[PDB]
Design an enzyme around this catalytic site. Sequence first.
Site, PDB file in Angstrom:
ATOM      1  N   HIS A   1       0.858  -1.180   0.000  1.00 54.32           N
ATOM      2  CA  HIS A   1       0.000   0.000   0.000  1.00 54.32           C
ATOM      3  C   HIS A   1       0.890   1.223   0.000  1.00 54.32           C
ATOM      4  O   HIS A   1       1.713   1.379   0.904  1.00 54.32           O
ATOM      5  CB  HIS A   1      -0.936   0.025   1.202  1.00 54.32           C
ATOM      6  CG  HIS A   1      -1.899  -1.109   1.215  1.00 54.32           C
ATOM      7  ND1 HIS A   1      -3.252  -0.934   1.029  1.00 54.32           N
ATOM      8  CD2 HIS A   1      -1.705  -2.433   1.391  1.00 54.32           C
ATOM      9  CE1 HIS A   1      -3.849  -2.110   1.096  1.00 54.32           C
ATOM     10  NE2 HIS A   1      -2.930  -3.035   1.307  1.00 54.32           N
TER      11      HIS A   1
ATOM     12  N   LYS B   1      -6.230  -4.890  -8.650  1.00 55.58           N
ATOM     13  CA  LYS B   1      -6.619  -5.405  -7.333  1.00 55.58           C
ATOM     14  C   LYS B   1      -8.121  -5.419  -7.212  1.00 55.58           C
ATOM     15  O   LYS B   1      -8.782  -4.385  -7.347  1.00 55.58           O
ATOM     16  CB  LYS B   1      -6.029  -4.520  -6.232  1.00 55.58           C
ATOM     17  CG  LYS B   1      -6.544  -4.850  -4.815  1.00 55.58           C
ATOM     18  CD  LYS B   1      -6.049  -6.208  -4.300  1.00 55.58           C
ATOM     19  CE  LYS B   1      -6.383  -6.464  -2.829  1.00 55.58           C
ATOM     20  NZ  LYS B   1      -5.664  -5.531  -1.968  1.00 55.58           N
TER      21      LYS B   1
ATOM     22  N   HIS C   1      -8.668  -9.848  -2.928  1.00 54.82           N
ATOM     23  CA  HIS C   1      -9.090  -9.892  -1.541  1.00 54.82           C
ATOM     24  C   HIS C   1     -10.609 -10.058  -1.631  1.00 54.82           C
ATOM     25  O   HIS C   1     -11.320  -9.145  -2.057  1.00 54.82           O
ATOM     26  CB  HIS C   1      -8.660  -8.596  -0.854  1.00 54.82           C
ATOM     27  CG  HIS C   1      -9.273  -8.344   0.490  1.00 54.82           C
ATOM     28  ND1 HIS C   1      -8.582  -7.685   1.490  1.00 54.82           N
ATOM     29  CD2 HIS C   1     -10.505  -8.599   0.991  1.00 54.82           C
ATOM     30  CE1 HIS C   1      -9.370  -7.533   2.537  1.00 54.82           C
ATOM     31  NE2 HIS C   1     -10.535  -8.091   2.266  1.00 54.82           N
TER      32      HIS C   1
ATOM     33  N   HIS D   1      -3.122 -12.689   1.011  1.00 54.26           N
ATOM     34  CA  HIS D   1      -3.372 -13.088   2.419  1.00 54.26           C
ATOM     35  C   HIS D   1      -4.356 -14.239   2.495  1.00 54.26           C
ATOM     36  O   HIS D   1      -5.446 -14.131   3.060  1.00 54.26           O
ATOM     37  CB  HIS D   1      -3.833 -11.921   3.303  1.00 54.26           C
ATOM     38  CG  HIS D   1      -4.823 -11.003   2.654  1.00 54.26           C
ATOM     39  ND1 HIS D   1      -6.068 -11.412   2.236  1.00 54.26           N
ATOM     40  CD2 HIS D   1      -4.743  -9.688   2.361  1.00 54.26           C
ATOM     41  CE1 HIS D   1      -6.707 -10.390   1.696  1.00 54.26           C
ATOM     42  NE2 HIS D   1      -5.922  -9.331   1.756  1.00 54.26           N
TER      43      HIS D   1
ATOM     44  N   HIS E   1      -9.613  -0.828   7.888  1.00 56.87           N
ATOM     45  CA  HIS E   1     -10.837  -0.904   7.092  1.00 56.87           C
ATOM     46  C   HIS E   1     -11.913   0.090   7.471  1.00 56.87           C
ATOM     47  O   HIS E   1     -13.038   0.014   6.977  1.00 56.87           O
ATOM     48  CB  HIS E   1     -11.311  -2.357   7.029  1.00 56.87           C
ATOM     49  CG  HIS E   1     -10.338  -3.203   6.283  1.00 56.87           C
ATOM     50  ND1 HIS E   1     -10.139  -3.053   4.926  1.00 56.87           N
ATOM     51  CD2 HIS E   1      -9.399  -4.081   6.708  1.00 56.87           C
ATOM     52  CE1 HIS E   1      -9.156  -3.842   4.541  1.00 56.87           C
ATOM     53  NE2 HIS E   1      -8.687  -4.474   5.602  1.00 56.87           N
TER      54      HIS E   1
HETATM   55 NI    NI Z   1      -6.568  -7.376   1.703  1.00 59.45          NI
HETATM   56 NI    NI Z   2      -3.724  -4.979   1.657  1.00 61.58          NI
END
Ligand code: NI
Ligand code: NI
Lengths: 570, 570, 122, 100, 100, 100
Positions: free
Chosen positions: A139, A220, A249, A275, A323
């Site tokens: 990031h 992404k 994700h 992840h 988040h």
């Molecule tokens: Ni993520």
């Molecule tokens: Ni991330």
Amino acid sequence: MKINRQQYAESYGPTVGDQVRLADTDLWIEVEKDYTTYGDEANFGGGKVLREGMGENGTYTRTENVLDLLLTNALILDYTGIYKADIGVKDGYIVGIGKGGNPDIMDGVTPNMIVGTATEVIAAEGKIVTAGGIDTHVHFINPDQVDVALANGITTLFGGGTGPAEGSKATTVTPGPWNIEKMLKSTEGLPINVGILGKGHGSSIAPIMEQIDAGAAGLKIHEDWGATPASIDRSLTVADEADVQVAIHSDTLNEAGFLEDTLRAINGRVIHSFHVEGAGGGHAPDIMAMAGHPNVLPSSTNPTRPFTVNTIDEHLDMLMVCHHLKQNIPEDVAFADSRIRPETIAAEDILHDLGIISMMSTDALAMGRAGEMVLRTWQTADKMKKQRGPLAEEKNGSDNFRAKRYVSKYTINPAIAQGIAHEVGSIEEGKFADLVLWEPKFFGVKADRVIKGGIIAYAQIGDPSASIPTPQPVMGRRMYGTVGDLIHDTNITFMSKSSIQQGVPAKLGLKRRIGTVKNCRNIGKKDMKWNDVTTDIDINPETYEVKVDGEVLTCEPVKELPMAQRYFLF
Amino acid sequence: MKINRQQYAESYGPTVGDQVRLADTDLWIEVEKDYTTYGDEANFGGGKVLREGMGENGTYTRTENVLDLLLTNALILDYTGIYKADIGVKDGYIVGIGKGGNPDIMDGVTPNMIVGTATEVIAAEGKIVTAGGIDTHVHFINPDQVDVALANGITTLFGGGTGPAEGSKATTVTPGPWNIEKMLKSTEGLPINVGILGKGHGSSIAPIMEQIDAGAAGLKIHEDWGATPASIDRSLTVADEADVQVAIHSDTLNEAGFLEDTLRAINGRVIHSFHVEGAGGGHAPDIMAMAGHPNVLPSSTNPTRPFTVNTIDEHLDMLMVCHHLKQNIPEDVAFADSRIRPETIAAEDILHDLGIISMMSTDALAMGRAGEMVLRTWQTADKMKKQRGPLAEEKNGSDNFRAKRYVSKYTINPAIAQGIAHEVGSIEEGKFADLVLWEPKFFGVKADRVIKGGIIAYAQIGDPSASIPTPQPVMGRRMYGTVGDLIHDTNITFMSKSSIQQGVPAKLGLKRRIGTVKNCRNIGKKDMKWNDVTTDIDINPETYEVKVDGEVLTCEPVKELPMAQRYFLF
Amino acid sequence: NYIVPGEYRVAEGEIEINAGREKTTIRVSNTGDRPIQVGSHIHFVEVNKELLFDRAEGIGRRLNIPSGTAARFEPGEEMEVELTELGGNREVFGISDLTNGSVDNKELILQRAKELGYKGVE
Amino acid sequence: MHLNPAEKEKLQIFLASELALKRKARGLKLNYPEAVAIITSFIMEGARDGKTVAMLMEEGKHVLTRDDVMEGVPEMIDDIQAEATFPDGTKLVTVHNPIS
Amino acid sequence: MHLNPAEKEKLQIFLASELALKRKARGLKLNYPEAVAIITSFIMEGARDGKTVAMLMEEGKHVLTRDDVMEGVPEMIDDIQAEATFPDGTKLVTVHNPIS
Amino acid sequence: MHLNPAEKEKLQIFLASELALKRKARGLKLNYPEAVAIITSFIMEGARDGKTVAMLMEEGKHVLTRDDVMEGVPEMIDDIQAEATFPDGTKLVTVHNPIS
Ligand code: NI
Ligand code: NI
Ligand code: NI
Ligand code: NI
């Protein structure tokens, strides 16, 4: 005349059969082969071998097989082997791995590794040399994160972001043509290789594709932007046309589907599952089952690596911040809590050890630590040796198989996943000279010197006012490769084929080396070096118990790690 | 379904009728109106509204009414109003103020504020958002002054200087074509907007005018270079031809004339009177009478703001250093002493409160503090509320009228004075996206995030090695907008029309955005937003008593201020 | 007199969300074995296939809950939720690809939902 | 903490003063930067304590005497200037000839 | 020493804490950055001591009380977050409402 | 003060030494950077005191012993080098194997 082995290793670094401890771990690497000719080792200094008419050739011009740089006596740790060699660099690329010197008088000189008038020397005797780390989950939040990464041996950052905007603080996304152009321009001042991910969201193709044409190197898909079946599908359609990678994700909430619905939307196409354990995000509780599939390239992010007694306790508040969640909203807390499972974190250690999770990454500044990808890879390997034993594949008491499996996770495999392994990700002839020297006592902890495109970019070095560079304070510092216009030649901006064809670099005035993203739609789990295992992973929806081949995968958290309080001031 | 107001404000920021305390002052601002549709508020994060097919549109390309950036739920404090809205940015400019999201499913979306694939999000819920500060009295003395300014919400620096040369340490002057060219080149590396003032001195037109043609954006008349009737006259003749502003620091000594002689030389032409109270310079003791005239745009500098018990004691030695004076020369000390008057400083507080002094400025590093223009504006407003009471114009117990009067002093009014308000100085559609986010607890003290041309340039942010950006140490840091070539696109160099027409940017290789100075000869005090009062100001030559409308203006110094020891480590 | 820096003094009263729009209460069950959490602004008919409810009653609607909140269904859990009407152009694109146009096209939306196994189509 | 640029820099002054005070305490005659650091940190801590500018202008002349410093140091320091946050905001303290 | 970027930065926190503790010891009510520095350095030294993250999450609420700080400071600090090297590597400590 | 680049950097060493000494005083076995900082600051303060280079080359071997530091730390430190202003100008002190 014979030299005993202890004295030989102290002068030239280790040779065939010798072992070296990695930092303060119980991992040992063994020298598998050595390209030298004993008696003709290259070395530099007062009265040493690399002198004109002797180990340095005085005849040939730079074009005639002469190197720009020779690293002498390196112990290479790479997916390709653990071995002793000189490394020759020219035009910013690795051109020879073998034996350097002067064919006038030395036996066994690799023909294109002549030390000549044009050749600089770095002494690698007693150092371990690895490829620069390839971090594919970055990031872009705070420019101070670059030095943090360099200090732990990372040389490529793939990800997204525009700074500390909430979108970027949550997701590896630089959205749209204008933000992408701005960040490509910003990248001109960042002393590290970079590739930028666009927003993998939309229900029409054009808004997604225009990011690729603008200069993005991939996409992404992130649940915070809606990880819906439509966004998944359109992103992969774009990626298949553009030859770039998609990172996902997935929908933790299971709002629009369960894991099986996401896999149906993917429809057998290639994807990089970020992840994959799921603390960093994804279908709760069973996302990690992704890592069993042949079309999935699975990575971990670093705060779950490895499973320790403090791991769970740090995570809830970390997630809430990242988040943009509120403590007073019960469903926000429930979402966060749903991601945090000791059962899957423990299994994640083992899946790494088995070669079922192929890659490491940071998640820098968004549930991840920019300077701990390499660090935590080795802590994981060490924990697994302690708890599981040497792997069955090992021999002579060395941990070489494990070392190759683990080094691949942060070097070659992320490069393959991203479509950039033609340029970076391993110590091989023909690749860009991004190299990290480590003292074995600091291996994986603090890099000695980080070479970028054949020039030192970062180094642990002392007092600039002193008579020599070793007096205190020894700290990480940017070197000449980062200064002036040299930052352009020592770093690569990776971009889509279409943006390159459409002249984006000229349009934006980019002066960095331009790397092409390619060959990432025609790969799969089978292409992950030393980490190519496909299997059915079962995750119990009630208990979160993880099974492979009918066996429950579990291990204990540890109270202490190596590569920790012996080394760090805070 | 209904939400109580406390819970609503904690989730989305305040709405109509709610009040917010400014830092630790006793000033309260009230939300006047709100552009939202209740139930369709935009927000970003895990499981939030701005997701594909939902609050984010998945259909439109960036050109089709889609934003590059949406600031959600901002509480805007501006001369135009104190109100709640989303702010939409595109191509580095504010394109919409209203309600952002997806017209597919939301009511009341402003048509050009679509959140699409191309859109980044900054969460402004619970933040106050203002225009970037416009500092028109900057001495370019030490490049470290830029971060100091950014940290207190300043985004434009107008002034002059070449570094720590005595001319520059005394006067806002970059003299002559060569020094101007050099400083325009230097400006390419300064992460803030800039305009440069030439020396407003000469008895022939050509030596003055050639500075304008070289790229100066205005002129400074300063007594240290001879603030004579001739220099005043020639500078204003140049300015009237070139359409740039002239700033004046008048003849404190009354050497060639008294105030009335300076006004006669000005001859009704437009001029910006710097530090009009006179501690920073000007006809002793009566310079502040300038602020009554219709052709004068009057500013204060910051060390006299507001009147406190320590104000007088710091000033003599400050002045001696700035103006290169000697303690052992009695007439040097007498000149310095003549400028320092509690009577006029006290009246200056009140003249600000009455809208008779229209602007604030720093005087950075030459009797002024680069990072305290915004700070001291609010301390002044607070002192005046405490001593004078709420203004008669206020309603519902709010300080909105005072807040608009005071915010105008460091945003829109300096921009109007300088001829740059078409680009900067307020949160309005069509203007450059220089925006400052503040947590209300830190309002006017330490900026949260400073956006320059639509990208974050400076932020209070934590540990770059941490898992998230909030852990300590949280400090001011340059962000990606300042890095590489992005510094060119996020900042404006303001220049004269003639220099632009003559191709100076191309000649010097300037890559920054180029702003045109215009419309500054056809304005007056009437054009100063919320601070447009003309009146006869009488200053007693013996006692320094200040009278307006037959009433003596005086107030007491205070022993304590808000926005002070609660916040600062030193 | 105690000063909390930056504190709010909110006005009296309450904020009504989605004012003037038709509200509809329906029962919804999670027939799956993992939890499903549904956000405020997802077209309700397009939620996870394994949520069982009268799918027709989700068309052109979303949860009548504060923007950015959600309803959480544990495995096997049935809950009663209140829906509100979508606004703006009343069009939905993407998500589960059940609509891709006007929400008025109920027959088409339901045909697609049924074919793909979204539970609760008649 | 929200440290601004000046807060970061001025931490150094406090540190240099602590260093210098340790040197003085073990019996050393202080040098030029040591003496400046001690007097400067004294001023900034005095502001934090809520003293006035006028108090510190005078107190600053009584922090170190010539027997505390090396030969010539008193004559090298014509004045010391420091800014700090007083109860009434940032102000400048100028101490003339702090060591006689 | 081989200091990395974070080690260099975090030295500042320790220094700011030492400054703040001296101010407290001479009787001053602490301000916002002072309070944050003290609690932050406490956390990082606790990690060095080998305490757990869970211990420090709770201990961090008992470092300073409202009578140690200026009016409004308790309400200005919603939480303090700090990372440090524990025996088991870097971890994050979040202390909610450290001063009641 | 007229601080040059080295004076600024070397303040950090003193600070790291103070940190490490506090850690030692509360009973902790010191780690690698802590040990290096203590020995380095010792050398620079010794120069300030007017010791010779030769004195410090030997004294530097008696600052910390192996029982003061964690396992392996003695073997990690092959030497420590530091430059400081002696009465006769800047000189380099090299201490070989400072912890046996
Ligand atoms: Ni993520
Ligand atoms: Ni991330
Ligand atoms: Ni002036
Ligand atoms: Ni000035």
